[PDB]
């Protein structure tokens, strides 16, 4: 219901333009490539970094393939 | 050890079948991570009575990090 | 032993699909104090065959006490 | 299962406000045996936009048998 | 108005000192959140006798939503 | 005595009571048939934690014949 | 809970935010005066819907008679 929109707005405001960009570049990759480590690597860099950011790593879930929701899950349990 | 205490809290305060429905629940979240389809079979067996509202509670350890603030949100609303 | 039990014959009658959306009715009167949704919601699942009736009355014991009568009394009159 | 599926899907295009209000009259139809009644709260829902037309037409699971030529004739007409 | 038809229905039942003292036991908890300080008063002046319950059950329409599934608890446990 | 290897393993990954439910669950599987509800108790013991998960894999060897295939789709899709 | 909720504030709010909350809760404390408590709260932790938390579990310091009106504020401005 235009969760996407959303989190990109959130992303650009929390992250500035070149991280807001450079979560985008690591999503379209494994839109492609379906490497689900190196997409939350960047995540997690860009995310983790502060506590009150959290909630945009938890979000990203909405891009995460359904074969990958566990894997996305046990590496953000780990971060 | 916190899973085997938690599966024999439930064995003990749902009996066998609740258990196995719970646990049931469980394994299709863990593919389908669809967290209100758990969360209602959970509320259903574990706030039929007040003695059993830890169970509900403590089910957190096997949600996912994506849906625990929704899961507390919803744990409250059933408890208060 | 009886939620368990109800569960399980709810399953095995209105099998997973009608069992969750039992169920999610269940959670959200169990939220919103709603009585003549849920029942509205329980009165499709179970109301479609005969069989099925003792389903609508057994779920007594999910309603809160202050809606109790008017739980029975629109039982009776669906069955 | 065609409840179930109903259901899902009647909650899918309406939203939760309109599935209810839809829910709540097939409660009052299977209590009144009012088909006019019911088949107006579901036209108005069900009629607002063409995708949503087949929510309309597949009500005829819940009606009652002595309805079901009246239903389908109307059901066509909208 | 159901609110006029509890208060005359508990003048009656509870007798004025009675009335009185659930009316400033509710106007205590519409200010301060309390429910289990106003229940415990209603809960003493209701379920003396058992023809008072419904005065229990009915008082949900001042007991705000969030309060709901506790009221229902307490209700449930005094039946 | 890949059997007695095992629940060496399971008995220190899972602590007494872990490995007691599972062996429980595997009993009550020799006798039912039932694949989903021991699947369920062994997944709920060891995926919690991904060192546990060779403990779900090594399950492998207690499954009758015509369940292993399941048994290997529904542990890769817990896993990975 | 009190001391994690100061935690939050100076890492959402920045220490000058934390402190003009913490200056407003103490004139609370002392005057008994809501609105102009909810008024700092508000400008501070509704600015931005992640920092709604902060607003909705300032009722922990908001004294028992005032807890109505609290929430009432809240929802009013969330």
Same mark, same amino acid.
């Given at each position: 219901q235009h969760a996407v929109s959303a989190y990109l707005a959130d992303a650009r405001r929390a992250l500035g333009s070149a991280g807001c960009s450079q979560l985008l570049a690591a999503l379209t990759a494994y839109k492609q490539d379906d490497d689900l480590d190196k997409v939350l690597a960047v995540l997690a860099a860009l995310t983790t970094?502060?506590?009150?950011? $959290?909630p945009l790593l938890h979000r $990203?879930?909405? $891009?995460?393939r359904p074969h990958h929701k566990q894997r996305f899950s046990q590496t953000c349990t780990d971060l």
């Open positions: 970094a502060k506590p009150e950011d $959290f $990203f879930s909405m $891009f995460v």
